[PDB]
Design a protein around this ligand. Sequence first.
Ligand code: HEM
Ligand code: HEM
Ligand code: HEM
Ligand SMILES: CCCCCCCCO[C@@H]1O[C@H](CO)[C@@H](O)[C@H](O)[C@H]1O
Lengths: 78, 59, 49, 379, 241, 66, 100
Amino acid sequence: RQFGHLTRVRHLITYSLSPFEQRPFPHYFSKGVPNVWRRLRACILRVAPPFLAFYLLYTWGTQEFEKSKRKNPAAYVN
Amino acid sequence: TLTARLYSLLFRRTSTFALTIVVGALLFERAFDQGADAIYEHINEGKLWKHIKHKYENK
Amino acid sequence: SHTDIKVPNFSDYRRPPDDYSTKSSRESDPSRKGFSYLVTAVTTLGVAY
Amino acid sequence: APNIRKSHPLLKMINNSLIDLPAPSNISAWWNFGSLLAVCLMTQILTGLLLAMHYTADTSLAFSSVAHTCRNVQYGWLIRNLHANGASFFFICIFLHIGRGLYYGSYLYKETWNTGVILLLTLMATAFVGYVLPWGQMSFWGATVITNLFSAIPYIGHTLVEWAWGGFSVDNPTLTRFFALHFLLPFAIAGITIIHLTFLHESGSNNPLGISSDSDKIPFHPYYSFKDILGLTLMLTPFLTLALFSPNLLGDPENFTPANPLVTPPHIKPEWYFLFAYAILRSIPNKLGGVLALAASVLILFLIPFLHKSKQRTMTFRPLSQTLFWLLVANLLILTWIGSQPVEHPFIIIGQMASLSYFTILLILFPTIGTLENKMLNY
Amino acid sequence: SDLELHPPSYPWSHRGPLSSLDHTSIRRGFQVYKQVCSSCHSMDYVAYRHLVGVCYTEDEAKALAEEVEVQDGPNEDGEMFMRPGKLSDYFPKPYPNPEAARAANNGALPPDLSYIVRARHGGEDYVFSLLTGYCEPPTGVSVREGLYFNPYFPGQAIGMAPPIYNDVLEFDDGTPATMSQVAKDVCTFLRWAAEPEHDHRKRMGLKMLLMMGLLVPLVYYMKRHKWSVLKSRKLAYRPPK
Amino acid sequence: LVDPLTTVREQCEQLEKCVKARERLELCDERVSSRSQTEEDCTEELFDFLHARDHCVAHKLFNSLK
Amino acid sequence: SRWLEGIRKWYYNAAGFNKYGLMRDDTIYENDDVKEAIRRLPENLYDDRMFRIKRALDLNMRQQILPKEQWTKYEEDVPYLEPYLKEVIRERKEREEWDK
Ligand code: HEM
Ligand code: HEM
Ligand code: HEM
Ligand SMILES: CCCCCCCCO[C@@H]1O[C@H](CO)[C@@H](O)[C@H](O)[C@H]1O
């Protein structure tokens, strides 16, 4: 598929300025950084969980394995 | 007015641009190496052979 | 009717500080292109290395 | 014609695939991996070729030919490193590439997706047979254990392995055919990679919001060329940092000992990018089923397109399955772990559990949470 | 029991990402390799030639290869004969073949140290700990004839007897040759011997980091620049109603 | 001549963890050698001492080496 | 005990396809049915949807959403295609049947 036969579009007016008449990385604070946060706090509660969960299991696992090696002070009290 | 002088003289003509990408590179190389080496070597005084050399080449 | 249509404001919003009406955009932009191209000129440069 | 860039039989091919090519505007950064994957390939083939020019494929010269390449061949050390570490950059990317597709339903473009699975299989094989080449303890033992697996295949089994490699055991006659195979496959990857992009180009490129992009596409080049080159550097910098500061960070030391058939190392395990499956392999005890689990761990990808139920393509607006998805990656991540560990209690369990939670999330949860997710939208 | 003790972790002069090897120490190490290890441990991949320009002068190294004679190609009559080693010869092998060595070191086989530092988990940290670390076996544990207890070694029984005590050799640069100290240099040597690139590879890593630093922001600004035309764009729907 | 090692170990062997670990060790040592038929070894207890001693030996040893 | 109605509203706001300003129907994946369906859609609606969909791609392109005010409220979402999409599907099942 090429250009000129994608869709039946009507009544949309767009306005844009040359790259040289504007700023590249504008308003890092006014709108920039906020949205970055507007995002970290939007998925953290959806992504983090299973990862955190994984972690606990990784730890439990390693710790347990590393315990089942050491001897029990009482396997021989005689 | 560097930037403006720059554009007019160096960045306007496709020809001029390329030509300063080269002369610009030669100069960048020479300067960027020395500088890096320097920074490198200095963070390692008395460890490099270039430093220990004299002891055995006489000194 | 189209006469009823204006171009929104990019003033401040996006325009770099040398762009606000009643002042020729042209005296200030050979300087604006100079910067940009300089950044690009530098990349081609760094890349060659 | 005027343009003379849209008329020429060859340029027209380029100006229609890297310029003037209609790409959606809202393409996410996840789409930067096809690019990377491709350049990742150019890179391997290069460094490899250049590295093959100093290698000898013979039990008695392999290990040292490589060593010599590193100690004698100018910048040889760097080339080897890049190639080795590159293998990983390659898989990390191919894995993020799969991902993006799995969760933007890119896979609904069946043909372009099926070839992609063939790309993964191929890229694997070439990387398995390629690690033997240096002929170190793991190279050898890995080859001997992993190849011998086919042995489970009843009847026409032993005879396959027994022919696959040299004659009776991973020895010279197999290092050669492996070297050859390694040299050949990458070019087949590139070949197929063309078919991949062909099928792709048939339809547009999918996008994050999963709804028709026709509404407003943008010329690839002016934009995406830049976009990808940016990605190239942003991802290539860690590659090099790793490649130049901790060269062996991801490499088994045991593979610095020339192969020796009288010393089987403890903990024989394939490269990390294979572990997840190595895990699911030793999950089921019955040697046969084990292979099948292994085979299915990857081949399942062919089924994904038939397990899509959502009335929506991507899963941007599908919070439920969204956690299911991450719950899944986490799962693979765990399988990886379990694979690097010995076959002992704390693990053995976590292993077959995770392994089980793998096939369920793909086979049964996803599709189910799928429809259920539809009812909730009144559909 | 698959129970083991793991080496600590010393601040080697060459662990910094930007810090190279201390060649003065490398030089030393070479000496302890040559004067003590080289009688059991082969180092097939390094050769005198390498010392040149790194921790020894050309002539200095030339004279150091002379000290050893090597077996060389057929006569005019076809037989093996000896001769003073040149600069191009690789470090001598202590034994004609493995089995030959296994029989000289009571069964065990002293590994070639060319890549040792990277053939064992821990690298120098490991080797060091191992060298300066033998001691009597703990209670209940008994090592057999010919083996020597060393906790740091898996199985805690090494076929290798403590190879390094105070003095044993005398660093000529004028350095207090204490076991601990001597073992340090030997380790920094083993490092170099395993990856001579090291210093080169890092100075390089520096230069790469600075390029990434400079290159990405440029292309970032460039990417941001072309795009702006969209990021800033403004739609509007105007049906004639 | 005196090896800085042995000096910096004497100090370390006095730090809490060490002293606390040396003890838990000497006990097992004198207990395993006291019976005639026991399977216990004092390897574990020993390592803990070494994993502790050495850890600080490292934090300082190299300060004295050239 | 727990209204599907309570739920549906939960999910709607959960999904979030409204923060972009588009109706539920503006997201249904365009398989064969939805394609026929949309083609039957009156022109009023077609252009309406067209703009919405583009306004969404643009937000998404900018990594920015629509201000809270403009978020389409659950109870005001207009199922503009479902009626059509429905006939399409039963029109088809009729044929999928006859041809047997
Ligand atoms: C010289 C100071 C010296 C070094 C250095 C050294 C190192 C070394 C290492 C790291 C090993 C490998 C340990 C492992 O297998 O993980 C090792 C092993 C043996 N060595 Fe050694 N060794 C040094 C010197 C000597 C000397 C002088 C001899 C011979 C008299 C010798 C011998 C051996 C032997 C035998 C082994 C045992 C291997 C085993 O499996 O038991 N070493 N050495
Ligand atoms: C080495 C092999 C591969 C290379 C070089 C490669 C290359 C590409 C390229 C150039 C793109 C375009 C940009 C993008 O959408 O990311 C692409 C798209 C795609 N690839 Fe691959 N690919 C490879 C492997 C795979 C694999 C393993 C799969 C399948 C599991 C796959 C699935 C896809 C699909 C579905 C698209 C994306 C469509 C979209 O969402 O827009 N590719 N691939
Ligand atoms: C598809 C891209 C490729 C992948 C995935 C790949 C992967 C690998 C792997 C895993 C290694 C092992 C590195 C190590 O020893 O740790 C390797 C080695 C090797 N590859 Fe490739 N390779 C690829 C392409 C090539 C090609 C096409 C050539 C050259 C024609 C090549 C030639 C070699 C050689 C000679 C070695 C042995 C030298 C060495 O291992 O250092 N490789 N490759
Ligand atoms: C993509 C960024 C690439 C960074 C450029 C790589 C720089 C490699 O530069 C290398 O530095 C060494 C140390 O001085 C020199 O000995 C080599 O001759 C030189 O090629």
